[PDB]
């Protein structure tokens, strides 16, 4: 439904109006370092983006994984 989108980095809902929200998709590495059909997916709000804070935060979470 219309009310089920939540930001991964700031843990609050994203409103339908936010032009600066974006979704980031990345592939997963294969054995011997090649590519695969499976995707990482992140939903990120505009508030982090206006500040500049997203650069470091994403680097943290790829390490967490």
Partner 1 sequence: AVRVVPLSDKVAKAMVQCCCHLGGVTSSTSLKEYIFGKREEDKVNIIDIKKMWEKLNLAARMICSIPNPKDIVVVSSKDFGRKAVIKFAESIGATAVTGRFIPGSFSNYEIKGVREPRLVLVSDCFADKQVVKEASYVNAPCIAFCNTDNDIEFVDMVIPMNNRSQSAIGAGFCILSKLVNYMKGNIDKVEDKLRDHIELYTYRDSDELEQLYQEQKIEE
Partner 2 sequence: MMDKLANLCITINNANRAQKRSVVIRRISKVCRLFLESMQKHGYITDIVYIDDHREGKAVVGLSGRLNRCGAICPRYDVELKDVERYRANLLPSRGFGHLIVTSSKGLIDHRECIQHNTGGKILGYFY
Partner 3 sequence: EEAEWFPKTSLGKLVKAGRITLDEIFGHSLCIREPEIIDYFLKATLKEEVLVIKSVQKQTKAGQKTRMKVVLALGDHNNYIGIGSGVARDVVSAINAAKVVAKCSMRPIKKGFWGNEIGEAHTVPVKALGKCGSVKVQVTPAPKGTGLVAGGVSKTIFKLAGIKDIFTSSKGQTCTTENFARASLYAITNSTNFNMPNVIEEKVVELNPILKNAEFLIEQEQRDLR
SS3 of residue 46 by DSSP = helix
Point out which residues bind partner 1 (CB under 8 A).
Answer: 19-29, 33-35, 39, 44, 49-52, 54-56, 58-59, 62-63
Nearer to partner 1, 6 or 24 (CB): 24
61 binds, among partner 1, partner 3, RNA, none (CB under 5 to 8 A by kind): none
* Beta bridge partner(s), residue 40: 26
Q: Which two tokens stand for residue 23?
A: 């979704």
Residue 63: how many CB atoms within 10 A of its CB? 7
Residues that bind partner 2 (CB under 8 A): 9-12, 48, 53
């Amino acid at each position: 439904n219309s009310f089920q989108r939540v930001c991964d980095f700031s843990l609050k809902p994203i409103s339908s109006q936010d032009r600066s929200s974006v979704q980031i998709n990345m592939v997963q590495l294969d054995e011997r370092g090649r590519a695969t059909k499976d995707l990482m997916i992140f939903n990120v709000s505009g508030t982090v983006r206006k500040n500049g804070k997203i650069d470091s935060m994403l680097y943290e979470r790829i390490n967490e994984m």
